[PDB]
Amino acid sequence: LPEPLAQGQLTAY
Amino acid sequence: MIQRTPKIQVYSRHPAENGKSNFLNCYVSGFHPSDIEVDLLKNGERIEKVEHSDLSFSKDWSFYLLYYTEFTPTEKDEYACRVNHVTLSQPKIVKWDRDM
Amino acid sequence: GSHSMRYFYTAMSRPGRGEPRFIAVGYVDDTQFVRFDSDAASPRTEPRAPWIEQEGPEYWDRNTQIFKTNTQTYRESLRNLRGYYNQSEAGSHIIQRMYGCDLGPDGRLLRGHDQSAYDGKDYIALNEDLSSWTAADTAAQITQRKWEAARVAEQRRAYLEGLCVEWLRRYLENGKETLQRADPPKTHVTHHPVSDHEATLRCWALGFYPAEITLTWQRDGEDQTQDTELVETRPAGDRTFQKWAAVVVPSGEEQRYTCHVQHEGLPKPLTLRWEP
């Protein structure tokens, strides 16, 4: 299973 | 921008036996960036139905792909792999050698 | 008995030819088991090994949401990095990420990994403490500061020590007949004169899994590292791998050379010679 999405927006680079 | 040219190996899935169905492979690796053109050739002509693995990469970030097609080796037929990449001035051709 | 899971993400911009392509592939050891490609007619997570096909629709949908959202995030990330390097909008660029967890022979977490690259060069990596970052340059420091501010490392750590290990263990069980089976190399030595006074000895290993292997030539018991031609281990297309090592030897000295083969699947290390 890949890393799931966080509760909010994922943090971009 | 730093780029890396592909390594190329052409070989068969199983040990070659004339008249016996097998798979012809062309493994391209160590290249960057990822765009690349690979043809398998039979007697100098492009083979139509070639499949390939999904794009992935090694620990040094260089990409690799396996291109493959069913083939039945004979004594006379010539097989090769033809590769182009941004790092190459013109397509590089590597002939299939059953001892390699 | 040791195993790993890795996901490999590649995001590639291509100005003038649509939005950046995002692909993700997942591996257990040397076995790919899933893919997602934003360029597919209908982008969705697809099985690439038989033992994953048993996962239900919730699994596939969960994966697909993750990869679709990553697709958008990586496009933002590509825009950001072009700016960090003052690059023009003309060029194509690539962010790569490889991450995952390693288990020891007892199925315990050995360590986690989470590394990123930009245009093929190290960019930022999570340290082994799973708590701090190493940034390659002043551009990656911007990412580091942003990720420190957002406590991203904490999120990576929770995944690497939690779901990563849990699901890896699940996959290892479900695919135990293959994932936990080492297939030893089938080996032989060939001989080809190159002239009246020299001949090539080539040591072959075929049909082995996993890819990790050691193939070396010795002369009179000494390693012939510099004189050995060693090809990159290469996939056969049936899950197994191939490799050979060659040395050119004085005609008549063939019996002074020995090929040594180490591989997980081997009852015991092999030593082989040319057998005329």
Side-chain angles (χ1 to χ4, degrees):
Chain A
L1 188 80
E3 181 190 3
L5 307 173
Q7 181 58 280
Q9 287 191 215
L10 287 190
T11 306
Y13 289 57
Chain B
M1 179 168 306
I2 295 307
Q3 303 183 315
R4 293 179 256 178
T5 203
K7 292 175 286 200
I8 307 165
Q9 296 195 64
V10 193
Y11 54 103
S12 53
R13 176 179 299 178
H14 311 295
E17 293 195 4
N18 297 156
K20 177 166 179 159
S21 180
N22 200 328
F23 277 82
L24 174 67
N25 290 328
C26 183
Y27 182 59
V28 287
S29 61
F31 61 96
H32 212 287
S34 55
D35 281 344
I36 197 170
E37 259 209 356
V38 178
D39 296 313
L40 294 181
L41 302 179
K42 180 187 177 179
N43 300 310
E45 290 171 24
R46 177 175 200 270
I47 298 168
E48 275 188 19
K49 281 326 211 187
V50 184
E51 298 176 316
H52 65 261
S53 56
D54 304 319
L55 191 63
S56 193
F57 54 87
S58 304
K59 293 194 288 180
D60 66 7
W61 308 111
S62 64
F63 290 98
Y64 62 88
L65 289 174
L66 181 62
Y67 284 73
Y68 57 100
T69 192
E70 187 275 356
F71 84 136
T72 295
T74 64
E75 170 71 35
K76 73 162 74 172
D77 288 313
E78 283 185 309
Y79 291 95
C81 182
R82 184 174 61 205
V83 178
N84 204 3
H85 184 257
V86 69
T87 60
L88 297 176
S89 297
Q90 63 181 23
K92 174 176 293 185
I93 296 179
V94 176
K95 295 175 174 184
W96 176 53
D97 179 346
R98 54 184 79 202
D99 291 331
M100 303 280 283
Chain C
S2 67
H3 294 286
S4 61
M5 185 160 70
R6 290 285 189 282
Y7 282 89
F8 299 92
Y9 293 178
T10 303
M12 179 193 69
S13 68
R14 46 181 171 190
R17 298 191 301 112
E19 293 294 317
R21 175 187 188 214
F22 174 89
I23 297 156
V25 296
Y27 280 75
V28 176
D29 305 323
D30 295 311
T31 299
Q32 190 193 346
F33 69 99
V34 288
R35 68 173 185 203
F36 173 92
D37 186 345
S38 62
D39 275 351
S42 300
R44 53 169 179 171
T45 310
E46 299 181 341
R48 295 293 274 160
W51 49 260
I52 200 69
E53 297 179 356
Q54 56 187 276
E55 302 299 340
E58 196 276 338
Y59 182 84
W60 300 104
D61 291 344
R62 183 181 190 182
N63 275 261
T64 298
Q65 188 54 80
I66 289 163
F67 295 142
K68 288 179 66 174
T69 301
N70 279 311
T71 294
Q72 303 302 143
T73 309
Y74 275 81
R75 294 173 173 178
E76 183 185 340
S77 287
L78 281 160
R79 298 191 287 273
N80 292 168
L81 267 66
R82 179 186 57 87
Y84 299 164
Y85 289 104
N86 310 302
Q87 290 165 336
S88 72
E89 303 194 42
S92 298
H93 295 95
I94 295 178
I95 296 179
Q96 285 159 271
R97 186 190 175 198
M98 57 185 173
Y99 70 89
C101 47
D102 304 340
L103 306 183
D106 52 13
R108 309 295 181 93
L109 175 72
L110 236 27
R111 72 161 290 174
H113 299 272
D114 194 341
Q115 306 159 252
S116 299
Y118 181 63
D119 289 339
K121 294 181 175 178
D122 282 19
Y123 181 79
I124 196 178
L126 186 63
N127 296 331
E128 191 175 1
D129 59 14
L130 306 184
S131 311
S132 62
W133 302 99
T134 294
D137 58 33
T138 50
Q141 291 174 21
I142 298 310
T143 302
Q144 173 173 346
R145 293 200 276 262
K146 183 190 301 199
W147 288 0
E148 283 164 340
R151 292 221 151 125
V152 168
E154 282 82 349
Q155 296 171 347
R156 307 293 173 86
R157 175 185 176 183
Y159 166 74
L160 291 164
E161 298 193 299
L163 289 171
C164 187
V165 163
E166 174 185 314
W167 282 87
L168 167 53
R169 283 179 188 140
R170 172 181 180 152
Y171 300 150
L172 289 171
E173 172 62 23
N174 289 167
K176 64 185 166 192
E177 302 194 337
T178 52
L179 296 181
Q180 299 184 52
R181 188 187 78 231
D183 302 321
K186 299 164 179 147
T187 55
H188 69 290
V189 175
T190 60
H191 181 271
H192 307 137
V194 303
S195 65
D196 285 352
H197 70 91
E198 283 184 320
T200 294
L201 295 182
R202 176 168 292 106
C203 190
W204 286 88
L206 301 170
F208 57 93
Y209 180 93
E212 172 61 40
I213 194 172
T214 305
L215 214 64
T216 62
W217 277 105
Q218 287 180 11
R219 169 193 173 105
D220 301 335
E222 294 294 293
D223 294 323
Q224 295 300 278
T225 298
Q226 207 64 37
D227 292 310
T228 301
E229 176 183 18
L230 205 66
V231 292
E232 174 183 10
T233 300
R234 72 204 189 181
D238 58 10
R239 114 173 188 117
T240 73
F241 295 86
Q242 314 179 343
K243 199 187 192 60
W244 57 255
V247 64
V248 180
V249 308
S251 191
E253 305 194 351
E254 285 84 357
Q255 293 311 310
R256 295 173 58 188
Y257 290 80
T258 55
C259 178
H260 300 249
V261 191
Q262 181 58 280
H263 181 90
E264 170 174 1
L266 278 169
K268 212 181 100 264
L270 301 176
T271 60
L272 315 154
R273 296 197 188 133
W274 179 43
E275 304 166 27

